[PDB]
Amino acid sequence: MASETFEFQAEITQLMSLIINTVYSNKEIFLRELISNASDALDKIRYKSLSDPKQLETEPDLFIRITPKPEQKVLEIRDSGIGMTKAELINNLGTIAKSGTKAFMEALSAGADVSMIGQFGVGFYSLFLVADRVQVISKSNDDEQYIWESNAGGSFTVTLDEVNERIGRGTILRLFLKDDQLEYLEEKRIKEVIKRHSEFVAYPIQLVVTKEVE
Ligand SMILES: CCc1cc(-c2[nH]nc(C)c2-c2ccc3c(c2)OCCO3)c(O)cc1O
């Protein structure tokens, strides 16, 4: 189907521009922020299910799963959290981050470390440290599966999903890695980053590794 195009709140476009271009050394912090967001979304579906247990039935398994796709230079981070409807994708990713992004950029101006980004509630955008494009594929129990896409420019698209694997419920962040950040496709590197900055996660963190049978 046809994609619909939307404009980001301008301060989010400013933040994306700063992040995709920064020469900040510690780019690996992106993974912590995305694992944190995944964990939060899983918190949300668990909490919602306390009073509406059927909500878990679309995907009873609660997990965070990381899949490198070397041939496409893609890294996927999936969770079986609450997901986002079309309206939530438009709102959560293109609008509500306006306030945090403004305050965070002022902090960056003054010398704050880019790693503080999560404390300003806008850690999602740290993916542009390693990626130049992202598709957020999401399925909420309350809507169809949709794809939100951004290349850090001022507009994003949202498209009903007729091309990706069905998610039972949850979200996949599909990161198209920059040419000099392909280390994040490697098994050893990924495990090293996770072990370092994400030790207290309540959900299993699965790593999908592809190997040749010899
Ligand atoms: C914002 C990026 C993102 C969102 C989700 C997700 N799925 N469903 C919801 C309600 C969310 C979400 C939304 C806002 C947010 C989140 C998670 O983490 C704390 C900060 O702000 C997700 O599951 C993964 C992910 O990377």
**What does the H/E/C string look like for 161-183?**
CCCCCCCCCEEEEEEEECCCCHH
Here the CATH number for the domain that contains residue 44 is: 3.30.565.10
Range of the domain at 83: 1-214
Segment 57-63 long-range contacts (CB within 8 Å, at least 24 positions apart):
58/139, 58/141, 58/168, 58/169, 59/167, 59/168, 59/169, 59/170, 62/203, 63/203, 63/204, 63/205, 63/206
CA–centroid distance, 214 to ligand 1, in Å, is 40
CA dihedral 78, 83, 87, 88 (to 10 degrees): -80
Which method was used? X-ray
Among 12, 21, 153, 139, which residue's Cα sits nearest to residue 88? 139
CA–centroid distance, 16 to ligand 1, in Å, is 17
Helix (H) or strand (E) holding 160: strand 155-160
CA–centroid distance, 213 to ligand 1, in Å, is 37
Structurally, the chain folds into a number of domains equal to: 1
Residues whose CB falls within 8 Å of the CB of residue 117, separated by 6 or more in sequence, listed in order:
29, 33, 104, 123, 125, 126
Ligand 1 pocket, residue 13 CB under 6 Å: no
Q: Which residues are annotated as a binding site?
A: 33, 37, 79, 84, 92, 98-100, 119-124, 171
At how many Å resolution was this determined? 1.6
Among 179, 213, 194, which residue's Cα sits nearest to residue 34? 194
